[PDB]
């Protein structure tokens, strides 16, 4: 079958890991500061 030459290859390639910047937990995200803040007089 001498006709138009074309190659079909589906692209589903996974991207490389992004490694985005990491959020920093608040001081009130730790159990001990939470206890100190809640137990305030």
């Amino acid at each position: 079958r001498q006709d138009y030459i074309a190659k079909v290859r589906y692209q589903n390639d996974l991207p490389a890991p992004p490694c985005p910047p990491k959020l920093l937990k608040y001081e009130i995200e730790k159990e001990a500061p939470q206890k100190e803040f809640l137990k305030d007089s």
Binding site: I28, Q34, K35, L38, K39
Partner: protein, 77 residues
């Protein structure tokens, strides 16, 4: 903490209108690391007093629910 919690409970039993006594009771529960017990007490008080304007109670409820995580919607409210 045990004695203060007992005193807060006695204050509540003497006069139920003392919201400050109940809030101190919940704070003492927090002091004794009774996270679940304080949460149950706070839910009972809020559901009985949904119209009460205890801003600090609602702030504490939001903080507790955020620590829980699954109850984020009540925390937002």
């Amino acid at each position: 903490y045990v004695q203060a919690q007992k005193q807060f409970k006695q204050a509540e039993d003497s006069q139920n209108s003392n919201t400050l006594a109940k809030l101190g009771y919940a704070q003492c529960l927090i002091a004794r690391n009774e996270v679940g017990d304080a949460t149950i007490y706070l839910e009972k008080f809020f559901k009985e007093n949904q119209d009460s304007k205890s801003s600090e109670m609602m702030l504490l409820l939001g903080i507790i629910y955020s620590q829980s995580g699954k109850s984020y919607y009540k925390a937002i409210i």
